[PDB]
Design a protein around this ligand. Structure first.
Ligand code: E32
Ligand code: E32
Ligand code: E32
Ligand code: MN
Ligand code: MN
Lengths: 481, 150, 482, 156
DNA sequence: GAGAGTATGGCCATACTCTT
DNA sequence: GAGAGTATGGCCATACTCT
């Protein structure tokens, strides 16, 4: 009736640490989602809150997710949902929000009561085919509901949107990427498994941040892709504008990813006040919806704006590094992965998802065909079928008699009994036959995909291409020589 | 007579039972320096509640309670809070554990607190080594332990 | 000018707010006894299928549903309202069943919505009974996406049963809770004789019955309130003088007044002994537990009179408190001061109308089904021709026309024939259809009788009210002295 | 707060609920005190009232100075609902009782139901001193019965 | 003297890891 | 540094009417 202190520490610590690793802070390699995000997305899908339908109150979404899947504080769920809605945070946003969802100035979103939201068109591609036995479903925390273990993820979300989680023992930091480039790299890899990271880089030039900006050099990126770890220099887009009377100004149009605009300004202001930087006369933020980011710094008449701008990179978050640390959950264990490993795992998820969907469609097609064969028999001998039923006292009797007489199965006999009298008309008779003929052709197509692995691989390629064409966009971040 | 009892509770007996609610995660004293520790309001509330004092000024005789019970949620975060609280006890009020005044409640309340387990410390050396490894500043030690038990 | 007059803005803005707080926030409806927020919580539970049989659901999900769907206001307003409906000391007949800390008499509120869970009570089902049988009118919600009930069927008299307490603009309302047995009895008495006096109704309804029990001093206050709709009722705590050996004494308080904060009362008495306002007390204790209920013990000084001291406490502290009755309810969607008889008359009419509407709905359904069955009966009698008629037809539109023209049947009947499953052709199924039709004909007659004769309809209301009284009615908790 | 002339300067009072140099924002959380019902000590202790006084920096009552005005335009921007209206009435009561001259100077505006982007605000103008004094007392005053009467006559 | 009950949402700290 | 992002919720004020 006593507990050892060393025994409690070891047991309790491990319980928490493992939980934070495998079910809180780290994303899955296949769908790029931490548990809270997956649940928010699935909850939107289950409540039917798609792009076509209207925005739903945030308190309803959060409350649904909490009650059904996520047994944690409402503020955790809401804040996660907010970030997925932010264009500066997510390269390809997964939530479409209405109202104040925050800004670049660090301003938080207004309380759940004053906001509303629904899923984005791209999120549908994460959920595509979920109901065709493509992924595994597990029970939720209470046992009352069932939830997806992973999402089908028809586009490579882990690299596309990136990840940033602090666990125990470890942490993760994956930058966002351009979708066009990624898919191209994926197609390149699928064609040739022996492709080098150098060769992959011809397709994927580097990270592409939603906030645009510039990456200084390829050197840091290459280490990152090859080893899974690396430091990448991010610098703001600034121009030195020349004015009347030799006066000058610096204009900032893009800032680094995850950098708070307001705090950066306050940092510069602190330098001018404390006389740690010399030359600046005035600092203004002319950021608007029309102009995007616009930060103007007016230089003194004597000052060399080139000198000041270079000082600012060295002294403020106008230049910041991103430290890549690519840990994702691979086979439900944390693993440091390089670029190729990430692409290999995602490709396999696609191959498996497509195979499983094809197997599901086949089971359905064959079931229906079997049923149709029975219905075809019934329509050819309708007069006898009708008399067989009428002569029977109960439905159990008719079932047995229909099976024994017309060499039908139990499922086929059931279907005949369930037939509506309207099926006996000309069009309906022809419809049944035409469905059967088409179904036979379709079963062959499905059978081909399952027999030859190259056909299945081509199908994955074809579907990825469609996604690239529909959702892929231009590179925003410039990589400088 | 202290011969009364206090309950530390994470989430939501008048004569003899005392209740002290702890909102949020407690500070990790193994990672923090003394000035920070003593300035933490939740830590200060606990010191005051017992009144024994910390470190060298500890007086076992001047204890307000002979039963101190850590009653935390039956989830993973409950465990984490439990580890954090034990760290504070081990580092700042070690003799309390030696005096067997600290308890851990088993199953978030009337029917529960009832089962209480006594916290007992057998090895001074092992515990010191364990605490530094699990709660310490060095990340790499923690990672290795996870690896080997994962 | 692009200018607004200050007096014109004041008058318009003020009126907008005042009217809204009156007809859609603070005042209850006379028929169901509910303010809009409460109605929405109850209906939201019903629509989400959260009933007494099923498990408790998280409060954040209930609140979020009500907020998104019906109540465009802060989450804290909805939650706090839901909490009160779950409190046994607040509601005489509670409408919500809660799990976790839902507060107590000491003023301490319920734990945050994240830590609490809830579902409807068995009695709440009787408020919602027959809602889907066109008994009440449904209106659009704030955004137009949903529909909600304008009022609930309310098969028990909820306004008087649970009471009301709302502060509006221009007015306020304060209705005390009542015993359900007594109410229904009064309702039955009134239905029997429309010209019944308030004196006569009081033979059934003795007075208010508070969930916190206690004692009402005299019937004089109650009479004024019931006759005029306004008056003051004296409520005093149940306290007994307990004797110990050698003349040692103590006062024990087992019940306190309605809506009186127990903690605050204790602190006030403590303030009186500290300030030397009252002399003769050695110790004040609260021993209240879930087992014992309310227990407040005051030990009296030796050779001090307990009777005298106890009487001072009534005069000085909330140990005795008055309830000021102010019976304003929404009648025809406008505020009105009503007496006891008017409240009972309006509720009775709601029941009469609800039952009429339910009966009319059932009849329309019964007749529809019968009409369908008559067609199916025709088809089964002439199946061979029916089958040939369909098979000869190229499209479903053709078969429909041909079935109508040939067997002298209606479009609805022809549709039903086409939708018929082949399994309906068996012996059992043929007999089943006939047996349904025979029973249906008998039922239509029963429904028609109720709608023709007004006494039959009135009896049905009586009968249903009696059933509710027997199932839910309980003992009177509050004692009326003298 | 605002990014020199008060003429160009405009301040917005908001009931909590993007795209603005002179423009200033002061958010008012909760219901504002009814100054018609309250005595001076209570009034001056109200945090929301104190924030507003300081914002304008003209002083109140006797010490009120039109010249001291920090902003030439004061806009009451409240929610488009019933409570918005109530807050609107409460704010106007404060202006009428403590800074009457501002309304006379036409510095106060009411924004009607994207509106902030200049790419409507209505002027509050005071036509009759006597009528307003009568109206304020009736609507915001301590006597309940007068308020009831107004509702009854104008209802629905 | 108060306080009965629906309405109108910020502000606070900590764990955990990584870094020109 | 400090802050990137999921986790663990109590404390504050006012309107409005009525004895
Ligand atoms: N004196 C400190 C200790 C706890 N606390 C606190 C608690 C918060 C928060 C923010 C907080 F500052 N906070 C911020 C967002 N969500 C929460 C939240 O859920 N909590 C509760 C669970 C502990 C104030
Ligand atoms: N401790 C409780 C006991 C009654 N009380 C009270 C009563 C008031 C008032 C103001 C009050 F605070 N109050 C304020 C204005 N008018 C009244 C008023 O008429 N009364 C009623 C009893 C006579 C507070
Ligand atoms: N100016 C700050 C200090 C006073 N205030 C406040 C606001 C509350 C509350 C409780 C409050 F104290 N409060 C308590 C419960 N719900 C609420 C609530 O919704 N609100 C918000 C809408 C006004 C806002
Ligand atoms: Mn917990
Ligand atoms: Mn509003």
């Amino acid at each position: 009736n006593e507990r050892n202190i060393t025994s409690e520490m070891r047991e309790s610590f491990l319980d928490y640490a493992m939980s934070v690793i495998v079910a809180r802070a780290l994303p899955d390699v296949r769908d790029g989602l931490k548990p809270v995000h997956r649940r928010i997305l699935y909850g939107l899908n289950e409540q039917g809150m798609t792009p076509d339908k209207s925005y739903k109150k945030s308190a309803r979404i959060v409350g649904d997710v909490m009650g059904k899947y996520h047994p944690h504080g409402d503020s955790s769920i809401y804040e996660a949902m907010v970030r997925m809605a932010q264009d500066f945070s997510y390269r390809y946003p997964l939530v479409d929000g209405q109202g104040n969802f925050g800004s670049m100035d660090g301003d938080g979103a207004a309380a759940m009561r004053y906001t509303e939201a629904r899923m984005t068109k791209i999120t549908l591609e994460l959920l595509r085919d979920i109901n065709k036995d493509t992924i595994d479903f597990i029970d939720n925390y209470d046992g009352n509901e069932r939830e997806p273990s992973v999402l089908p993820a028809r586009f490579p979300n882990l690299l596309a949107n990136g990840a940033s989680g602090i666990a125990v023992g470890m942490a993760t930091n994956i930058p966002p990427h351009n979708l066009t480039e990624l898919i191209n790299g994926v197609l390149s890899l699928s064609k040739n498994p022996d492709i080098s990271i150098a060769e992959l880089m011809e397709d994927i030039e580097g990270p592409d941040f939603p906030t645009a900006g510039l990456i200084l050099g390829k050197s840091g990126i290459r280490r990152a892709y090859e080893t899974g770890r690396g430091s990448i220099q991010m610098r703001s887009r600034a121009v030195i504008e020349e004015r009347g009377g030799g006066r000058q100004r610096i204009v900032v149009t893009e800032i680094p990813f995850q950098v708070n605009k307001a705090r950066m300004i306050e940092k510069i202001a602190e330098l001018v006040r404390d006389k740690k930087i010399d030359g600046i006369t005035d600092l203004r933020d002319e950021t608007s919806l029309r102009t995007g980011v616009r930060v103007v710094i007016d230089v003194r008449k004597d000052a060399n704006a080139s000198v000041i701008l270079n000082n600012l990179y060295k002294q403020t978050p106008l230049q910041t590094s991103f430290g890549v640390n690519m840990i994702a959950l691979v086979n439900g264990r944390p693993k440091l992965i390089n670029l190729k490993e990430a692409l290999v795992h995602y490709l396999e998820h696609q191959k498996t998802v497509v195979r499983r969907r094809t197997q599901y469609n086949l089971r359905k097609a064959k079931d229906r065909a079997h049923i149709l064969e029975g219905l075809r028999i019934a329509l050819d001998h309708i007069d006898e079928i009708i008399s067989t039923i009428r002569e029977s006292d109960t439905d159990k009797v008719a079932m047995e008699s229909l099976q024994q007489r017309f060499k039908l199965s139990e499922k086929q006999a059931q279907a005949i009994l369930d037939m509506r009298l309207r099926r006996l008309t000309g069009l309906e008779r022809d419809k049944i036959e035409a469905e059967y003929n088409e179904l036979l052709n379709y079963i062959s197509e499905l059978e081909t995909i399952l027999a030859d692995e190259e056909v299945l691989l081509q199908l994955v390629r074809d579907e990825l291409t469609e996604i690239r064409d529909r959702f892929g966009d231009d590179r925003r971040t410039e990589i400088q020589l | 007579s202290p011969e009364c009892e206090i309950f530390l509770v994470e989430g939501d007996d008048s004569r003899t039972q005392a209740i002290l609610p702890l909102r949020g995660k407690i500070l990790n004293v193994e990672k923090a320096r003394l000035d920070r520790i003593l300035n933490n309001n939740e830590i200060r509330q606990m010191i005051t509640a017992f009144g024994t004092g910390i470190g060298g000024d500890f007086d076992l005789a001047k204890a307000r309670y002979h039963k101190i019970v850590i009653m935390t949620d039956a989830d993973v975060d409950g465990a984490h809070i439990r580890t954090l609280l034990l760290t504070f006890f081990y580092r700042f009020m070690r003799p309390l554990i030696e005096a067997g005044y600290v308890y851990i409640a088993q199953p978030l309340l009337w029917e529960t607190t009832r089962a209480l387990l006594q916290v007992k410390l057998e090895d001074a050396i092992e515990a010191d080594q364990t605490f530094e490894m699990l709660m310490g500043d060095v990340v790499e030690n923690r990672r290795q332990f996870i690896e080997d038990n994962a």
